[PDB]
Design a protein around this ligand. Structure first.
Ligand SMILES: NC(=O)c1ccc[n+]([C@@H]2O[C@H](COP(=O)([O-])OP(=O)(O)OC[C@H]3O[C@@H](n4cnc5c(N)ncnc54)[C@H](O)[C@@H]3O)[C@@H](O)[C@H]2O)c1
Ligand SMILES: NC(=O)c1ccc[n+]([C@@H]2O[C@H](COP(=O)([O-])OP(=O)(O)OC[C@H]3O[C@@H](n4cnc5c(N)ncnc54)[C@H](O)[C@@H]3O)[C@@H](O)[C@H]2O)c1
Ligand SMILES: NC(=O)c1ccc[n+]([C@@H]2O[C@H](COP(=O)([O-])OP(=O)(O)OC[C@H]3O[C@@H](n4cnc5c(N)ncnc54)[C@H](O)[C@@H]3O)[C@@H](O)[C@H]2O)c1
Ligand SMILES: NC(=O)c1ccc[n+]([C@@H]2O[C@H](COP(=O)([O-])OP(=O)(O)OC[C@H]3O[C@@H](n4cnc5c(N)ncnc54)[C@H](O)[C@@H]3O)[C@@H](O)[C@H]2O)c1
Ligand SMILES: [Zn+2]
Ligand SMILES: [Zn+2]
Ligand SMILES: [Zn+2]
Ligand SMILES: [Zn+2]
Lengths: 367, 367, 367, 367
C-alpha cells in the first residue's frame, strides 16, 4: 500500500513568537476565534490582542471551558458565529489545542495552534481526543487535515513549570521506538499508509535530540530561560514527535499508557509521564538490548520521568492492577498489535512486572 | 529570528496511486479542475476520470497550454468557473504543477498535485515560477501555503523516460549542500525563518538516499519497473528535496543554475541537469574536501548527470560565457550570498572553470 | 577580505632565560629602559643587571608604579630620556608588560617583554590596556606592531604562586573556543583580517595542550619546579593563546569577562579566572555537546578555576547581577557579536544562569 | 637550551592585496624604496605606485638587477639614500625578496616583503642567501630580525606560471619531515634554540595542507584563478613552510638540495623541485614506512614534481654524480647531521640511488 506522511502546513518556533502571531496569521484569515485557557489568557491575552490588532485582524477571545468535549465545541461555535469568525486560534496546552482543531473542523475553517507548553505531541496532529464534560474519554476524532500553522513561543514554554517540559520529553521518547516497531512489523500508520523514510528519520532524530539535549534543556527550564538546547527539545517534543507518531506509527508504549486508565492510581500524572514508563515496558516486551534499556532508563531518570510503578503512584495489589492494564492495553483495535510478531496480554503483563523490577534496580544502584 | 519548516499537508507515494486519487481527494472538495499536459492525459485521463467518478467527485478536464504564465492561469480560472470547480488538481511535470498551484491560489481553493515524473522538487513547494507565454522567465510567485496534498504514482514515474529521473537526482543532489551552507551562514530560508533541525535532517537524508539508492533506482527506471530503490529515490527527489530546499535553504548551486540563462548554450538540458553541475561548482567554491567532491562527481557520472561544461553543450568562448554566468549568479538578491563568508563574481568565475577541469579529469581517468 | 596573522618577532622560553637576556637583546639596541614591578626587581634586578652589563648594554632601572596609565607612561618616558634609552624591556606581569609596550610605542623604539608569570596572553599582543591611575579601565591602545621579543624564564614562572599559572590556563582555555566561533561566523580578528589556518591551528593546539598537560603542570607549579609539562603550558598560556586570540578572534568568553566589571563581586579574582567561567558560559550559549562542556568543566575543576558564580564570590541577587553582566557583555562593539547567528542580552543572561547551574551540579557530583 | 620561535611581524594574504599595500605600510614608514624585478614591475608598477601614493607614501622605484649580491645591495643603498628612503619594499620572487631583506638590514630600516610567486619559503625568514654577481653561491647572511610585514596578493600568484606554484609545494613538502627529524634528534634550529610546539604544529599543518589541497590548488593555478584551495597552499608554501623550516629545523632534504650544486645537471630546475627529490631521499634515509613514501611520491607526481634523477635531467654516470652529491651534502656544517643517529656520505649515496629506483618503479606502475 502507499507510503504517506502528513504535516502541519507551517511550523514556527522561537522566543517572543507570540508577538508575531498577527503577521503570521494574516495570510490565512482576518477574523479569529481565540480559544485559550483562563490561566494562559491571564498572562498572554494583552500581547495576543496587540499582535492581531496591529496586523489588522479581528480577535474574538473565548475562554476555554477546560475539556475537549462535544458540548464545548458547540458552545464555541455559537460564540464564533456571533463574531463572524473565519478561522480558529487555539492557545494553551493539549486540551485547548485539540478543542481548537475540532472546532475548526466543524466550522470548516483554518486553524492555528499556539502551544504554551511542550508537554505532548498533540499540537501537530490531525487528531482530537474527545472527552465527556466530566473528563471521561469519549472517542478519537480523526481530522481530514493537520493544522494550517503551529506557532511555539519558546519563551512562554520556558516560563512554564519545568515538570511539563519533562512530561513532553516522556511523550516524545516513545516516538522512535513505536515508529521503529511499526516499520519492523509493516504496520499501517495513522496517516493511513506505510511509513516514509522521512517520518522514520524525524522519529529517530527525535530520540537522539532528547539524548543529546534533554539534560541541558531541563537546566534551562528550571531557570525559566531559553537556550538552544531547550529550543531543540521543544522542536523534538512538538514537530518531530508529532509527525513521528502520526506518520511513523504507534505501538506498545501508547497502548500501555491507555491501559493505565483501567486503574485509578496514576490519575495525578501527566500523559507524557505515563508514556515514559510505557516506553520502558515496550523495550522489555521487544527484548531491547541491555545497553538500550539502560540508556532510556537513565534518560528518564535524568529529567525526572518515572521508571517504576510506584513513581506513578501505582502501589498495592500490583498483580491485579497490572492484569487490568495488560488486558486493556491489548483490547481490540489497540496499537499494541503493531508490534512485530504480535503480542497478547500475558506478554504485556510479564513486561510490566519486569520493567518495574528493572526500574527499581536502576533506582537502587543510583542510591 | 524564528525557525520555520513548511510542508504539503499530506504526501502520498506508491504504485498505482492514481487509481486511489478519488478517495484521497474526496475529504478536500467535490468539484475538481484537472490541469494536465496533453501527453499525460493521453495515457492517464481515463484512469483519472474513473477514480474521481467512482468517489462521487466532479472532474473538469482542462488540457494544459504548456507554460506557467499569467495568461494561462486566467484562461484556466475561466474554465474552472464555468464548471463551478471548488479545487484544483495538477497532473504532470513541473510547469503543469506550478500552474495548478498558482491557479488554486488565485481561486482561493485547495490544490492537489500529482507529479507524473520526479524531475524537480517543484511539487511540494509554496512557490510557482511564472513565465511569459514565449517561455522567458517572469517572476517567482511566493504562495501563502504549500499544496494540500501531493500524490506520486511511482508506476507512472517509472514508466517515464529514465533521463527525467536522473534529472530529478540532479535537482535533489543540491539539497544537502545548499541547506548545509545556509545553516553554516545563518541564512534565512524561503520559509521565512532560520532552519529547523527537521529540515536539515531531511536535507541530509536526501543526499544519503541518492548515494545509497541512485544507481539501483536507475536500473529500475531504465527497465520502467518499480523497486524499493526507485521508490526511495522518488521520495528523495520530491518530498525530501522539496522540504529540504524550501525550509533548509538555497545557496550557490541554484544561483549558478539561474546564471546559465545568461547564455543560450544549455537550452536543451533539464533544470536538474544544470543544478548538478551547479552543485559541483559550489563544492569547489566552498572548497569541499577532495573525497566529497569525488563522491559527488562519481554519483553524477553514475546516473548520467553532467560534470563538465561540454556535457551541458557549453562549448567555445568559455571565459566570456563563464563571466556572464558568474555575474548573473551574483546578481542582487541571488541565493549565492547565502554562502558562508560571502561570494563575488570573481570567486564564482574561478569555481566554474575549476569545477569544469575537475570533471574533465574525472571523465579522463574513467576513460 | 585578507587573512592576517601577527606575531612577536621572536619568542624565547626556558629555565634560566633571564641569565641570557643581554645576549638576546644586544642585536636590538644598546641602552635599555627596564620597567619592572618592585616585587620582581626584589629578586631579579641583580641577575638582570649582570646579564645586560656582561653583554655591554646600558640598563636604566625604573620601578613600575603598578598601573598601565597615561601618567605612568609619560613618567617613564621622562626617565628614559634622561638615560638616552633606545629600547624598552618590561619585566613582570600583565600590567608591567602592557606599560612597556605602550611606552616603547610612544618613544618609537623596540620593546622586549619578559613575563615573570604566565597568567594571561598579554605578553605577545599588539595591544595595551590603558587604565586610569585609580585603576578604572580607560581604553584599548592598539599598537602598530607586536613586541620585538618575548623572553619567558620558566624557572621564574615556576617559582611564582601556583594560582597564577592556573589563572593563565583559564585565559588560554578561551582561545580555541573564541577563535573557533570567529571562524564559524567569519568575524574579523584584531589582526584586522579573517583568520589564517596557522592561527586556528595554534588556537586548537593551545586547548589540546591544556587538556594533556594542565594537571601535570600544576603539580610542578605547586612544587615550584620546572618539568616539560609546565614548559608546554607556559608556551600555551603565552605564545599559543596570544597569537590565538589576536589572530584567531575573540567572542563571547571575553565579552562576558568584560561584563563582570558591571558588578563589584569578583574584584579579588584574576583576569584568567573570570575568563574561565566566561568560557563555560559561551559553551552553554553556543550549545556545545555535553561531553565538550563536561571536559572543559573538569579541566577547570582540576586546576582550581571557577565553574560557578559563587567561586568568583558572586553571591546574592543573582538575577539583577547577571542582567547587568549580560547587558554590558552585549554593549556596542563587544566581541560577543562575533558569535555565529548573533547574540542578545536575553540569550547571554540565560547562558549565565544555566552555566552556573551546570557548574553547581558538577561540583555536587564531585562531592 | 631555550626553545625559540621566530616570525615576520605581520603576514597578510588575499586577492588584490597589492591594492592595499599603501594602507598596510603606512604605520611602518613614509618613504619606501621599492626593489622589484623588471618583469613584475611590468605589470605591477602602476598599481603599486597608486596604492602608496593614495596613502600619502613616497615610493622610489628601483628595478632589481637579478642577483642577491653585495654589489647589488650597495647599488640599491645608494639609490635609497638619494631619495631619503626610510624603509624597503621587495616585490617579486626569492632573489628580489632576499635582496630587500639584506638591504633593509644594512640600512637599519623596516622591510616589507611582497611575494609575487609562492615558489619557496624565503619570504618570511630572517635569512638572505648572498650570491656573487655571476650567480655562484657566496654565503648565508643571517638577519637579526624577520621581515616586519609579508603581503601576498594571491591573484598575482595565481596569474604566475603554474610550475612555480608546484615548485613552492616541493619546498614546503620538506618542512614537516625536516622539522620532525630535528625534533627527534634534538637539533638546534636556525632560530637558535630547540623547537617549540608551535613550530612543529605549523610544520605538520604545512604537510597536511599540501596533501589535502595540493591537487585542487594546481587546478586553480593552471586556470590562473583563485580558489580557497589555492589560498591555503599559498599560506602553506609561505608562512607555514617559512616558520616551519626556520623554527622547526632543517635536515637531510635541504642538505641534499645543496649537494646537487656539485654537478651541473639540474641547473634548469627550481629550488623547490630539487628539494622535492631531496625529501624523497630523506625518507629512504630515515627508512620511512612504505605507505608514507608512497604518499609523498604520489603527491609529488600529482603536481608535477620530480621523483627520479632523470626528471631533474640528472642522466649518465649516476654513480660518480651521486657520490659528488652525497659528499657535498655531508660537508661540515651541513644540516644532514641533524638527522637522528647521524649520517655519513655512504648512507646518503645509498639513499640517493634507492630513492631514484623507488621513483622509477612508481612512474612505471603509473604507466
Ligand atoms: N490530538 C493528539 O494527537 C494528542 C496527543 C497527545 C495528547 N492529546 C490530548 O492532550 C490532553 C492533555 O494535554 P496536556 O498534557 O498538555 O494537558 P492540558 O491541556 O490539560 O494542560 C496542562 C496544564 O498546563 C497549565 N499551565 C501552567 N502554565 C502554563 C503555561 N505557560 N502554558 C500552558 N499551560 C500552562 C495549563 O493551564 C494546563 O492546566 C489530553 O486530553 C490528550 O488526550 C492529544
Ligand atoms: N515551484 C518550485 O519550487 C520549482 C522547483 C523546481 C522547478 N520549478 C519549475 O518547474 C519547470 C520545469 O519542470 P520540469 O523539469 O518537470 O519540465 P516540464 O514541466 O516542462 O515537463 C517535462 C516533460 O516531461 C514530459 N513527459 C514524458 N513522459 C512523461 C510522463 N510520464 N509524465 C510527465 N511528463 C512526461 C512532459 O510532457 C514534459 O514535456 C520549470 O518551469 C521550473 O521553474 C519550480
Ligand atoms: N594587552 C593584552 O593583550 C592583554 C591581555 C590580557 C590581559 N591584559 C591586561 O593585563 C593586566 C592583568 O595582568 P596580570 O593578571 O598578570 O596582573 P598584574 O600585571 O597586576 O600582576 C599580577 C601580580 O603577580 C605578582 N607576583 C608575585 N610573584 C610574581 C612573580 N614571580 N612574577 C611576576 N609577578 C609576581 C606581581 O607583582 C603582580 O602583583 C590587566 O590590566 C589586563 O587588562 C592585557
Ligand atoms: N632566505 C631564505 O630563507 C630562502 C629560502 C629559499 C630560497 N631562497 C633563495 O631564493 C632564490 C630563488 O628564489 P625563486 O625560486 O623564487 O627564483 P627567483 O627569485 O629568481 O624568481 C623566479 C622567476 O619568477 C619570474 N616570474 C614570472 N611571473 C612572475 C610573477 N607573477 N611573479 C614573480 N615572478 C614571476 C620572476 O621574474 C623570476 O624570474 C634563491 O636565491 C634561494 O637561495 C632563500
Ligand atoms: Zn502521547
Ligand atoms: Zn531546483
Ligand atoms: Zn584574556
Ligand atoms: Zn628550501
Amino acid at each position: 500500500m502507499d507510503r504517506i506522511i502528513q504535516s502541519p502546513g507551517k511550523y514556527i518556533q522561537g522566543t517572543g513568537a507570540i508577538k508575531r502571531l498577527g503577521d503570521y496569521l494574516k495570510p490565512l484569515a482576518e477574523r479569529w476565534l481565540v480559544v485559550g485557557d483562563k490561566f494562559v489568557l491571564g498572562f498572554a491575552e494583552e500581547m495576543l490582542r496587540k499582535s492581531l490588532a496591529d496586523a489588522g485582524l479581528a480577535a474574538e477571545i473565548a475562554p476555554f471551558g477546560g475539556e475537549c468535549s462535544h458540548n464545548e465545541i458547540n458552545r464555541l461555535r455559537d460564540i464564533a458565529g456571533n463574531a463572524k469568525c473565519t478561522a480558529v486560534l487555539g492557545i494553551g496546552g493539549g486540551k485547548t489545542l485539540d478543542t481548537a482543531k475540532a472546532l475548526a473542523h466543524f466550522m470548516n475553517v483554518p486553524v492555528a495552534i499556539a502551544p504554551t507548553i511542550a508537554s505532548t505531541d498533540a499540537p501537530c496532529s490531525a487528531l482530537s481526543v474527545i472527552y465527556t464534560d466530566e473528563g471521561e474519554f469519549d472517542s478519537y476524532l480523526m481530522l481530514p487535515r493537520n493544522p494550517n500553522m503551529v506557532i511555539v513561543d519558546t519563551q512562554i514554554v520556558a516560563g512554564a513549570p519545568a515538570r511539563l517540559l519533562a512530561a513532553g520529553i516522556g511523550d516524545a521518547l516513545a516516538t522512535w521506538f513505536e515508529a521503529r516497531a511499526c516499520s519492523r512489523s509493516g504496520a499501517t500508520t495513522m496517516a493511513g499508509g506505510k511509513c516514509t523514510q522521512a517520518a522514520l528519520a524525524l522519529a529517530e532524530l527525535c530520540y537522539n535530540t532528547l539524548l543529546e539535549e534533554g539534560e541541558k534543556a531541563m537546566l534551562a527550564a528550571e531557570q525559566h530561560v531559553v537556550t538552544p538546547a531547550l529550543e531543540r527539545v521543544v522542536e523534538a517534543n512538538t514537530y518531530l514527535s508529532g509527525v513521528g507518531f502520526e506518520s511513523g506509527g504507534l505501538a506498545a508504549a501508547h497502548a500501555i499508557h491507555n491501559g493505565m486508565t483501567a486503574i485509578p492510581d496514576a490519575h495525578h500524572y501527566y500523559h507524557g509521564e505515563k508514556v515514559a514508563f510505557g516506553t520502558l515496558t515496550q523495550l522489555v516486551l521487544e527484548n531491547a538490548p541491555v545497553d538500550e534499556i539502560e540508556t532510556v532508563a537513565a534518560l528518564c531518570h535524568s529529567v525526572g520521568l518515572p521508571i517504576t510503578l510506584a513513581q506513578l503512584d501505582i502501589k498495592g495489589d500490583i498483580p491485579t492492577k497490572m492484569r487490568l492494564v495488560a488486558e486493556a492495553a491489548c483490547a481490540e483495535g489497540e496499537t499494541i498489535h503493531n508490534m512485530p510478531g504480535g503480542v497478547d496480554s500475558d506478554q504485556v503483563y510479564a513486561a510490566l512486572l519486569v520493567a518495574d523490577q528493572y526500574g527499581q534496580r536502576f533506582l537502587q544502584e543510583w542510591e
